[model samples]
Target: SMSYTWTGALITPCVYATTSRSASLRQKKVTFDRLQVLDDHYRDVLKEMKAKASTVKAKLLSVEEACKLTPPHSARSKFGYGAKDVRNLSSKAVNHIRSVWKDLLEDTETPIDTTIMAKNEVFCVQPEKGGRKPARLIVFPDLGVRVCEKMALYDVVSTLPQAVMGSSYGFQYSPGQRVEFLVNAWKAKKCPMGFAYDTRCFDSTVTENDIRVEESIYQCCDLAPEARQAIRSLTERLYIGGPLTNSKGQNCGYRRCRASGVLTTSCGNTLTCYLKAAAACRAAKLQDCTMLVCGDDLVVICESAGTQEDEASLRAFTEAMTRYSAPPGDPPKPEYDLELITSCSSNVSVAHDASGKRVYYLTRDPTTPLARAAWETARHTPVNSWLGNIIMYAPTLWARMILMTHFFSILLAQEQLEKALDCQIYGACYSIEPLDLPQIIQRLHGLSAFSLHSYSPGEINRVASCLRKLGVPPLRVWRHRARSVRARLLSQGGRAATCGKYLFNWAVRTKLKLTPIPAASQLDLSSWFVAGYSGGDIYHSLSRARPRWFM
Candidate 1:
């Protein structure tokens, strides 16, 4: 049996070892160094992304206008109000957020301090390593700062990097798309080589200098004076460093640590890390110019330097990163036997294609998804996390039948099958209309969701293994439940019937025509929704007409 162990960072190959379980607690240390290097391509990408960032700067909406963008089903309010009330344009919630926004604008010089709170993240650990890993802490800013963040940085964070890096911006492409790109890159080179480097405490390591550099990068965009000042002030007070508080009401300490929940963290890390990595690669004279970077998650493929030079090049890369204050969590693990390496918690795992030929995919341990699934069953979750996971991980057997059947069955029982909610893919938000289920399924799973797929031994074993670890019902039980759910959906007809045809089509011998969703094209999905203090989508849709305050 294949064993998995958690290094507190990733689920990687390791054997069982008798280790006592205890809470691993450590304080975050943040420091700054101005000394750094940037190459031509790094500058060029920043310049391009900055240009796109400028448009957003000029297009700053009023507080009211921005509030209009808050989606109805955004994350609930931690600030003593129902998320639904906020979504329905509740004056009280709107006024409160407006006051918060006004105070942010008026109090430019005062260093804005934000409160920090911890959230839980679960990881699968080997029984010997400790059956389940300790809950990981994610520090985030308070509700007011969060809203201010959305108004100031959401546009640039969500879209600008994709413009500059193109397909190299890892979040823009799905796992399947990434796999396809890797295969092609390998084929084009005589001796393709790849490796993944893990950045230790990536969010925590972001320094004062790093934050300022990011601010400077943003300055390349022609921002409105007010917007520019807001960005600068926010960076100094909240972004550069802030105070930390634990659940017990003790002043734990001050934090130079990056808030994992900040809007800028994702894009900021991508730009800074890419600049460092790109310069290092150039200095090392590595052959590849193209790189895949999703925040701190990085993968590079280029002409091989053979085993000896490969070792030398990797060390040089490491040196460059350390100089930039971004040291590796684990050293670069390079492979000559394989052309592509997995980063971003993803691996090139095997499954089957339509023709029954073996196919490769980017996958990770199912721990996170399963944990979210259990939450959905046990409590009322605002977002349909299981459905979203099913869409993204459709190719994996565990996701396709088990997660899908589980959630849909639950929705069916509650008569909420038509409930469309907000979900995010690749940091970009979407409405996720159930009426458009066919279109989404087809795009994600390549029409194979409707077809029969024989489970490979490895795939079956993975599913079985996950079930035992997570303590979920078997696949057989999911199949039986799915039959009734499929019938219920089919009986409803119309768009529901269309969903039945695509999502559960494989269960029956007869096939229904795959209908295209008309709403997919018409929806104005430009401004990505921000989740607010309550944990629901903050901005619903970008208000069509500008509000009076903008003028």
Candidate 2:
């Protein structure tokens, strides 16, 4: 037997220090005398957002229509023929689904308590004292109720908010789009200051009344009787919540939670929180500060009032939230200092593009994405969550040269390069083709992904700050590997060759034209599942082949 072991020294993590990093951690209560002054432009943005919110359809979908949105590749029923069999749409799986539907109709009185548990998440920044911030997964529903959730709420949850929030529907955009919106919005206010808001335990704060109110919002649409009944039953059992179970099978007792795993969790929270925040903004008379809310993430960009007035206005805003039953995370301390406020666990960072115009991007510590990359490298996953990460962080050096290079090489080697995997961005499901990586990259990072540009001194320092703070690789290493990856991709032909030429074309000026993706209809990519009765014909056949397991 041959065995080998290697040992190496660990590099020190980078410290991304800035004004925000040095700020005092003591939570200061916001208390001011009067509402902040607002300007005409600030008023215009809020008016626009509010008007869009007014036009949201909030239409409920039929159970069948909702079911249709379920990706064929969605995690399958734990109660049915295994995940693979259900994904193949086996007759047994279909039969199981029907029985569940039937049970919903008949067992109207039975409670459907969801299992609640925490999942780990990465903190965007390390705490001041030199350790990572504590992260915990929020409560979420189990897989069984998740499918039922899709049946009840998928369509409305996915479609309605974009109508209401427009680009502010946070899940709808890549990081580029998000930064672009924030920059444009801030400029639209003529460069006035804005700050992001953080809510504590938003899901847990959702009460039974909040659940009913959300349901009423859905009822604005005409629903099928069965769909309506099913929704009501699900609400009473799962949404309003019931008992909890631990992994050890212990009854943790009855509890009400807006399980983070439910399909409606994101949408419901967005709608409810928005309604509350909008009302609060109005009540507080926070002049011209319109809000951009996505679930629990919130940002308010308004005219710059003096510190005193701004603090007063923020306190009033907190008071308004209190009345709405959606209070702030800790006493609603607002951040006037831009860098201190992190939304969606991402902080705003600066960079320069090919042109001289300033480019803003969303940046976070690489901990989560890096760890996930290592995990997916060896395991089969339901989603190529990596692809989504690449797009979101496309502008970053690590994403462009390292992540892109690493995953593409691994995927090509495994012969899975051509396989289409499902991904979610901004809550909408898309079937992405890896062959279209060039176009996707272009849309996200611009030409920045291909060539290194002259970065501003400020931007240079920022990247260095992030690298040392997060302890990510230096640009020199990424550039070195990228050359190798570029060569390997070009050495291969067909799509691989095409990908190499397009993705790394900066290495050479010669360009290759991209080919269009073939229409999906041309492919007969059917599930190889055959549904037939094999046990017997009409009368007999005592001879069946199923006794092996028993034997």
List the global CA lDDT of all models: 0.61, 0.55
Cα lDDT tens digits, model 2, 418-488, are 77766545544456667656556665555554444443455456555665665567767666666677788
Q: Lowest-scoring 10 consecutive residues by lDDT in candidate 2?
A: 532-541
Residue 15, candidate 2: how far off, in angstroms?
15
Let me know the TM-score candidate 2 reaches against the reference structure: 0.72
- 1-551: candidate 1 lDDT, tens digit per residue: 00111123311111111121222332212223333444574566556555655554334555555555455544445566554554455777777777766766676555544333433433344565545443334445555456566677655565566655566777666667777776777677788778887877676666667788788877665566656767877887777766554444345455564556667777777877776677668666788645888788888787887889988988888887777667887799767544236577666666655457666665666766787778667866556567667767777777767877777777778887767666556554455655556656555446654553665566577778888777788888877777787898889887676666667765665555454444334444344221112222243421223323322
Candidate 1 displacement at residue 53 in angstroms = 6.5
What would the TM-scores of all predictions be? 0.79, 0.72
Q: Model 2 lDDT vs. the true structure?
A: 0.55
The local lDDT score (0 to 100) that residue 252 gets in candidate 1 is 44
